[PDB]
């Protein structure tokens, strides 16, 4: 499952240890320009809430997933997936 | 800090949810050909012990890491690096 508790633990590691991915997400899937920083406010089964510093200045964007997340691994799989595709284009 | 408890938790997750990689490591860093499948047995700070099925026979190899692992996060970062570098090998 994906509960707010499960969300925060994700956004703690993601922000602490995988920050360059959060930026690549805002850049490719968030349609931001010259992203200096991005952090995950929340992750739910339908999308994640990013706080991005990008062209025009700091903002909150919502990235919607193509499909709902059934479990937590779904979230692992999407964050590996989005990283790969976001690296493929640029 | 990697305790045989944390090795079992990483190895089980790797084994049930990311086997395509375990096989990539065994291929590229384990110098294995026609890798039917592979499994993570254990991960200690100096390397991982892997069960890689060659065609008609099972071998136990160890991938020593090119730099010691401090903690679990270092453990994630290398499983991530080695995946990236294994796919490049093409
Ligand atoms: C012990 C539990 C975990 C294991 C064994 C694990 C393993 C991996 C592996 C093997 C990859 C490479 C994927 C591939 O190339 O196919 C990966 C990527 C990733 N993982 Fe984990 N992971 C774990 C927990 C987490 C958690 C808790 C988060 C976030 C909250 C996370 C976030 C990511 C991200 C964002 C990627 C893509 C990173 C990139 O492109 O650099 N992982 N993980
Ligand atoms: Zn996973
Ligand atoms: Zn990590």
Author numbering:
A (entry chain A), B (entry chain B): 4 to 93
What's in the article?
Using a phylogenomics-based approach and complementary structural techniques, we identify a family of dimeric hemoproteins comprising a domain of unknown function DUF2470. The heme iron is axially coordinated by two zinc-bound histidine residues, forming a distinct two-fold symmetric zinc-histidine-iron-histidine-zinc site. Together with structure-guided in vitro and in vivo experiments, we further demonstrate the existence of a functional link between heme binding by Dri1 (Domain related to iron 1, formerly ssr1698) and post-translational regulation of succinate dehydrogenase in the cyanobacterium Synechocystis, suggesting an iron-dependent regulatory link between photosynthesis and respiration. Given the ubiquity of proteins containing homologous domains and connections to heme metabolism across eukaryotes and prokaryotes, we propose that DRI (Domain Related to Iron; formerly DUF2470) functions at the molecular level as a heme-dependent regulatory domain. We heterologously expressed and purified the recombinant protein encoded by the Synechocystis gene dri1 (formerly known as ssr1698) and tested the heme-binding ability of this small, soluble protein (96 amino acids, 10 kDa).
The heme-bound form is a homodimer consisting of two monomeric chains running in the same N-C direction. Although the homodimer maintains the same monomeric fold per chain, a two-fold-symmetric zinc-mirror site binds a single heme cofactor. The heme iron is axially ligated at the interface of the dimer by His79 (Nε2; 2.04–2.13 Å) from each monomer. His79 (Nδ1; 2.11–2.14 Å) is in turn bound to a zinc ion that is additionally ligated by His16, His21, and Glu76. The heme propionate groups form a salt bridge with an Arg90 side chain from each monomer. In turn, two zinc-bound histidine residues, one from each monomeric chain, coordinate to the iron center of a single heme cofactor. These zinc ions may help catalyze the formation of the imidazole-iron bonds by increasing the basicity of the histidine Nε2 atoms in a charge-relay fashion and/or play a structural role responsible for the precise positioning of heme between the two monomers. However, we report here a protein possessing a two-fold symmetric zinc-histidine-heme iron-histidine-zinc coordination center at the interface of a homodimer. SEC-SAXS shows that heme binding pushes the system primarily into the dimer state and no higher-order oligomers or unreacted monomers are present. Based on the structure of Dri1, we propose that heme binding leads to a Dri1 homodimer that can no longer bind to SdhB1.
